[PDB]
Amino acid sequence: DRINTVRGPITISEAGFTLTHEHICGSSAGFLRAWPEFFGSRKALAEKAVRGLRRARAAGVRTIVDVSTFDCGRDVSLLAEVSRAADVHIVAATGLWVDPPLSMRLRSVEELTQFFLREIQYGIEDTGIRAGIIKVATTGKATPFQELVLKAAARASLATGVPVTTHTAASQRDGEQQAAIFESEGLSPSRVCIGHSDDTDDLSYLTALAARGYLIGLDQIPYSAIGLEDNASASVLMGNRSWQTRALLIKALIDQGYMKQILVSNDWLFGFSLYVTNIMDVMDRVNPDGMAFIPLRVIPFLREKGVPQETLAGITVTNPARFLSPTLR
Amino acid sequence: DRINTVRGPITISEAGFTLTHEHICGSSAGFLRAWPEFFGSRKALAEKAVRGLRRARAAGVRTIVDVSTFDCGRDVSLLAEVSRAADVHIVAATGLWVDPPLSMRLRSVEELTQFFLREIQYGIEDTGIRAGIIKVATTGKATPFQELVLKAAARASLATGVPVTTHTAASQRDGEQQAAIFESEGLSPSRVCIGHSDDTDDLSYLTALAARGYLIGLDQIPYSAIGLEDNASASVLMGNRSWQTRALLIKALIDQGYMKQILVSNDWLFGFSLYVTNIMDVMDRVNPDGMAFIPLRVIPFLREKGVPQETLAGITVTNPARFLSPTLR
Ligand SMILES: [Co+2]
Ligand SMILES: [Co+2]
Ligand SMILES: [Co+2]
Ligand SMILES: [Co+2]
């Protein structure tokens, strides 16, 4: 009945309005520490991030879940710093993303399980800060290594009650194989969110997962490259569908009986080193609201379309709490 | 005049007997910090390192060059720590190895140059410790990225007079492509060591490079998997030829008249996460002498084969000093 944050455990009520897939900095292990000038400076990155969280907070956001893993450039100390400065809860992640180093790629499923358990039960690095979620990733059919990561995440979840959240290629219908591997590990679908699921309009894929009891992460709502057509990065990054097209999936799933399975987010960041050098400026030009995009634009959008207050509050408050609070079922 | 160490700048004369290609911990960026228990613990790894350095110090070694890069898992405060406790100088490296993460893979040669210069002129991370060497790597034909890294290294070298050392697949004669690229950038061969050159029986390859002004890194002398040939990890890493065979190349280059171009080392480590998980113990079993193998085994071996004392001292003292002391030529 307690969710771990970068400032300690909080109760369920304290979580409140939660964004379930966000980042402070999108990068690689040690990159921020080794080359902060890439982000202007570590101080500039911090100030940017604090200003963003304060705006999100003014918009009603109380908690975010930072789903940056070790190899995804998680700097937990930075997460801790910005959290106290903005008074926004940040839940830190363990697991692995799509770019694990050789030191991880050579590990067994038993060692991977030990490491995830470390970051959950013991602490991240030497900070004593505990991960509150496990993040895994595939882009298309799982590699032999990604099979181990997924099995290991399932095992860490089953041992702690901490949930698993995923990065997918929705077009490749990644969730159907992620689901198959998790259920073979005996992991409850109620402990899993299949993310990036808003990247496609394939509703039959989404309700199949939602029917099994998975959580559906519609977590890139503001992502759109419309207007920035010839920008290579922004197109592979954000695709061609409008934000209103991504947000309609929320109503569509509400209308098929699955509002209790919907988690919503921006997948926003304040630093991003994994594309063209200036990808953060380009994303900022697309979404000047940042993390406040969900509460300022998406929530009113759905209200205008007839979705009651009661249902919206359930998606952004009740759903993340049920999901994040440690349990096996 | 001076060389950058992890304990600050030193006069050339303090360098003494220098091992020019070693490691404290061969890992991935942030890996020791995130998962210290892979190595027993950070303390255990540090004590093991300090034990090893002291033993090499008793054997005559005064300075090592640690050529772990960012992606090689360089932990520069660990290096400093073991340096102070064992009283052995340690020159730290910039550059990139064969495992750069995505945030590095996506950078341009001008960005890469910015990074290497960062770690030389400014410092590594936030430690104030400055690199005194640039390490780069190829494995057969340079990938498009590796081409950028080598060019970036040459430009950084040309800006600071700090030298470049390389990992190669010697049997593929990588030294020839590396050199062609280095020279296209206007970098003097006297600021470049072609490492891992003892992996080949082809002395023509070596003397051609030495004749061009290059230093030749006979830097893996204790490496051998004879007696454990069915250990796949050790075989790929260490090969199937004895240490004497590796050591006899030093004499062949000496007899050819190129003692001025030779640098010897062990390529030893105290921690190793980049292979099967116990690779370090397997290596310790093959070479209990560790970093003291060069002074304790290789030097008396070559003295016994009729190499003068002034030649062995010139290779382990003079050549490293002339290499590391900052110059463009
Ligand atoms: Co993702
Ligand atoms: Co994300
Ligand atoms: Co090497
Ligand atoms: Co090496």
Swiss-Prot record, chains A, B:
Transmembrane segments: none
Cofactor, free-text remark: Binds 2 Zn(2+) ions per subunit.
Organism, scientific name: Brevundimonas diminuta
CDD domains: PTE
Positions bound to Zn(2+) 2: 135, 167, 196
Subunit structure: Homodimer.
Biological function: Has an unusual substrate specificity for synthetic organophosphate triesters and phosphorofluoridates. All of the phosphate triesters found to be substrates are synthetic compounds. The identity of any naturally occurring substrate for the enzyme is unknown. Has no detectable activity with phosphate monoesters or diesters and no activity as an esterase or protease. It catalyzes the hydrolysis of the insecticide paraoxon at a rate approaching the diffusion limit and thus appears to be optimally evolved for utilizing this synthetic substrate.
The protein, known as: Parathion hydrolase
GO biological process: catabolic process
Taxonomic placement: Bacteria, Pseudomonadati, Pseudomonadota, Alphaproteobacteria, Caulobacterales
